[PDB]
Ligand binder design. Structure first.
Ligand code: TRP
Ligand code: MG
Length: 456
């Protein structure tokens, strides 16, 4: 009977993140999910027991090498189910399993897509590193959980080996691809005009339209991640490294979580610079909350999320338990809603993803038509952008973010993507400036990291 076994040790955040970095430089495949500013857990994935890669109807699991045709997440889950475990309520939400991503283009197994946009990045549709051995930092308790899988004798030997690896002193740290043209300002602006025609003709109400920027990669991706983490920390940050791509994720948005039968999504209405006093934050938050246009856009997407959770929840169980609540941390304020449902029996991880992915807040309403319009207008596949990073538990819990504020590093480039909610009265130029301003945190992280390596 497979089960997690765990030991909790006192540990400081700085020590965890510093020891992670030094252990990680010897692992060709690794991942960090970090609560940089407002979450509870940071999860270190150093030594995978398996890697799962799904692209264009083929999944490979290297555990041995298994492969299967079809829906990659369905293939993953039929293998992953064999390693399932019972929850140990003493351990963190993540107590072992798969960490990685669903590409936006996993949506091509959920709905019928045309093949119009260029796949120039070659992003996997799904990519998971699977862990029997993990380290989970609890920010609340200042403890490190060391977790391994057994079946009591071999348990504590494995846990004492993990404890030694995390406590042993280590020294201080020390192929050009061919890519398509992103949108021009004119290209973007004409696609805005096309969306407005589709809204006027009743096809859609709102569409997230996005633009990709790229620059030469001259610094190690983990250096870029440390800069983004210092300047724009968020609760759903992630660093993922493989030999062929690296992910630098600064996301503050949850797509979906499952804790037992409880399903949760948290759509963000908008984000704002904090003031200097609480009275100033109240007034600056109220300006977003009291905006009738913004409120109505948000009500539309909350309703979309309810109909999404509705597809796998017990009828009449879907509720909005928080509506345009204020989430403050570091220099930033989020206006955010919380939608909940009770998972109906028979529905699994794959059914939940098909219901909620990709998120309503980075597509539009209604979602299926909106994705057809996005695929028709955008010159490139989104790949990881507005996909989801997260974890599937052996115990059938899960937690996925939305990939925004993210650098995808491949083939000598750093790719940055951002968008804007196009509505019936959108001004093309204003929506183009909005999407360009949203890439500022990534542009700055890259610029700060490069200048940092010039210091001699
Ligand atoms: N913030 C999450 C953990 C986490 C960090 N980064 C993530 C990225 C994706 C999913 C989860 C996470 C928590 O405290 O529970
Ligand atoms: Mg707008």
């Amino acid at each position: 009977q497979r089960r997690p076994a765990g030991k909790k040790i006192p540990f400081q955040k700085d020590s965890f993140l510093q020891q992670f970095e030094k252990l990680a430089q010897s692992r060709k495949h690794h991942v960090l999910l970090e609560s940089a500013r407002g979450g509870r857990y940071s999860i270190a994935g150093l030594d995978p027991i398996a890697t799962v890669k799904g692209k264009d109807g083929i999944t490979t699991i290297k555990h041995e090498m298994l492969f299967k045709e079809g829906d990659p997440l369905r293939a993953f889950h039929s293998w992953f189910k064999t390693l399932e475990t019972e929850t140990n309520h003493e351990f963190p939400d993540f107590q072992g399993g798969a960490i990685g991503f669903l590409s936006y283009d996993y949506a091509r197994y959920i709905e019928n897509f045309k093949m119009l946009s260029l796949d120039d990045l070659e992003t996997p549709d799904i990519y998971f590193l699977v862990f029997d051995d993990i380290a989970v930092y609890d920010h609340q308790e200042e403890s490190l959980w060391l977790i391994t899988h057994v079946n009591q004798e071999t348990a504590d030997v494995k846990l004492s080996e993990l404890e030694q690896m995390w406590l042993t002193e280590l020294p201080a740290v020390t192929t050009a691809g061919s890519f398509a043209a992103p949108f021009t300002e004119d290209g973007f602006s004409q696609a805005v005009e096309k969306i407005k025609q589709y809204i006027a003709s009743g096809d859609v109400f709102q569409v997230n339209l996005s633009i990709r920027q790229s620059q030469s990669l001259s610094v190690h991706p983990y250096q870029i991640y440390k800069t983004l983490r210092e300047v724009n920390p968020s609760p759903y940050m992630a660093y993922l490294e493989t030999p062929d791509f690296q992910i630098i994720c600064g996301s503050p948005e949850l797509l979906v979580s499952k804790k037992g039968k409880l399903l949760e999504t948290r759509p963000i209405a908008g984000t704002r610079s904090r003031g200097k006093t609480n009275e100033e934050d109240e007034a600056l938050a109220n300006e977003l909350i009291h905006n009738e246009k913004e409120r109505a856009e948000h009500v539309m997407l909350v309703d979309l999320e309810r109909n999404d959770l509705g597809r796998v929840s017990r009828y009449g169980s879907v509720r909005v338990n928080e509506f345009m609540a204020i989430e403050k941390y570091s220099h930033v304020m989020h206006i955010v809603s919380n939608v909940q449902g009770e998972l109906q029996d028979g529905y699994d991880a794959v059914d939940i993803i098909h219901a909620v992915f990709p998120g309503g807040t980075i597509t539009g309403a209604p979602k299926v038509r909106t994705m057809e319009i996005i695929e028709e207008l955008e010159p490139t596949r989104r790949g990881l952008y507005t996909g989801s990073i997260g974890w599937f538990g052996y115990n059938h819990d899960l937690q996925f973010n939305i990939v925004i504020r993210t650098i995808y590093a491949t083939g000598g480039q750093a790719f940055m993507q951002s968008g804007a909610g196009v509505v019936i009265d959108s001004v093309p130029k204003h929506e183009y400036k909005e999407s360009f301003k949203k890439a500022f945190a990534m542009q700055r992280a890259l610029e700060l990291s490069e200048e940092e390596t010039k210091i001699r």
